[PDB]
Amino acid sequence: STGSATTTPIDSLDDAYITPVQIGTPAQTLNLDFDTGSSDLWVFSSETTASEVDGQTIYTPSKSTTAKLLSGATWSISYGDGSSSSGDVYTDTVSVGGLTVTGQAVESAKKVSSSFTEDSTIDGLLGLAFSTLNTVSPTQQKTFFDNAKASLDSPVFTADLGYHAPGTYNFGFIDTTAYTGSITYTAVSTKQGFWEWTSTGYAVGSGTFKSTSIDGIADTGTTLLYLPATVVSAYWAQVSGAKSSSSVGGYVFPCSATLPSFTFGVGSARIVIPGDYIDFGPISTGSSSCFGGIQSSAGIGINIFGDVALKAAFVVFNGATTPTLGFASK
Numbered sequence: 001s002t003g004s005a006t007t008t009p010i011d012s013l014d015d016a017y018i019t020p021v022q023i024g025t026p027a028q029t030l031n032l033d034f035d036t037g038s039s040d041l042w043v044f045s046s047e048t049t050a051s052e053v054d055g056q057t058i059y060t061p062s063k064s065t066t067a068k069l070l071s072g073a074t075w076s077i078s079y080g081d082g083s084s085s086s087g088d089v090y091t092d093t094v095s096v097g098g099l100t101v102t103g104q105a106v107e108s109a110k111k112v113s114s115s116f117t118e119d120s121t122i123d124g125l126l127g128l129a130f131s132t133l134n135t136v137s138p139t140q141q142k143t144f145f146d147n148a149k150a151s152l153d154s155p156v157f158t159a160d161l162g163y164h165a166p167g168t169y170n171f172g173f174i175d176t177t178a179y180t181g182s183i184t185y186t187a188v189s190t191k192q193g194f195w196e197w198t199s200t201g202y203a204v205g206s207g208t209f210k211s212t213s214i215d216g217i218a219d220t221g222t223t224l225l226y227l228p229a230t231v232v233s234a235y236w237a238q239v240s241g242a243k244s245s246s247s248v249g250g251y252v253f254p255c256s257a258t259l260p261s262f263t264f265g266v267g268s269a270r271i272v273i274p275g276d277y278i279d280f281g282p283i284s285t286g287s288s289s290c291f292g293g294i295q296s297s298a299g300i301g302i303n304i305f306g307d308v309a310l311k312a313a314f315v316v317f318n319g320a321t322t323p324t325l326g327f328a329s330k
Contacts, residue, residue: 005168039135046061048110218310222304227303253290
């Protein structure tokens with residue numbers, strides 16, 4: 001089997017992407033944030049505290065003929081941005097882009113933190129990291145990918161995120177029309193439950209490439225590119241008037257600037273992030289200070305190749321017995 005679904009930016013900045021997901025019988029379609037940095041499929045639901053729901057579409061298990069309470073199971077998750085959610089668990093039929101899994105754990109939120117409530121466009125998350133990170137207790141549950149894997153034509157999914165445009169998540173096949181040149185594959189460590197890999201270095205603009213190992217994670221659920229402070233300082237030093245602002249919480253730059261590109265290495269290959277991808281617009285409405293898309297990972301404890309980086313590539317998440325990542329230009 002295969003599946004193919006379009007993923008759509010939630011706003012004009014590409015702060016996140018949503019993908020429609022069918023849950024239950026008859027189908028209830030929710031728009032989920034596919035997150036290769038976590039391993040829980042959780043939804044706004046009929047159980048969510050009413051004051052914490054503001055415009056989201058909810059899953060109502062009582063209206064699904066295939067929903068079953070997973071008795072005694074609970075979940076609770078905290079993300080890198082400080083957000084959180086928790087609740088109880090159903091199993092139900094879940095389809096993505098025509099690919100169906102029966103018996104998928106659908107984590108129903110009883111509580112969500114304010115950032116979730118305030119984002120009306122995201123109805124929940126679909127985690128695509130390794131199932132070792134799944135938070136269900138006392139019986140850990142599998143991701144949608146892990147449950148689909150054995151049925152897929154190939155044990156892979158791909159992320160093809162757009163810049164200010166829709167893109168695609170495919171399951172079970174590699175669309176050879178969706179990228180240019182060849183795909184470079186690189187090793188993955190699953191020791192922390194992430195798609196963790198090592199970039200071979202970077203360049204700023206037209207500058208020379210710096211060969212240096214940068215360990216980090218491929219994380220579709222993180223907006224920005226978080227890299228070591230040395231690398232980030234070297235990038236922003238090329239932008240007149242850029243500075244790190246402790247009050248704003250990262251590097252800002254004059255909205256009048258033209259940003260340089262940023263290149264990262266994948267083995268001997270290179271992915272170029274155009275400068276425009278690094279502009280996250282005014283820090284507050286009408287400001288002439290703009291927020292940067294490359295930020296320091298210092299204090300986060302891991303480097304994160306978030307959407308800023310991944311949207312410059314066609315990315316293969318290879319879930320074979322030994323997982324690997326692949327990157328191609330597009």
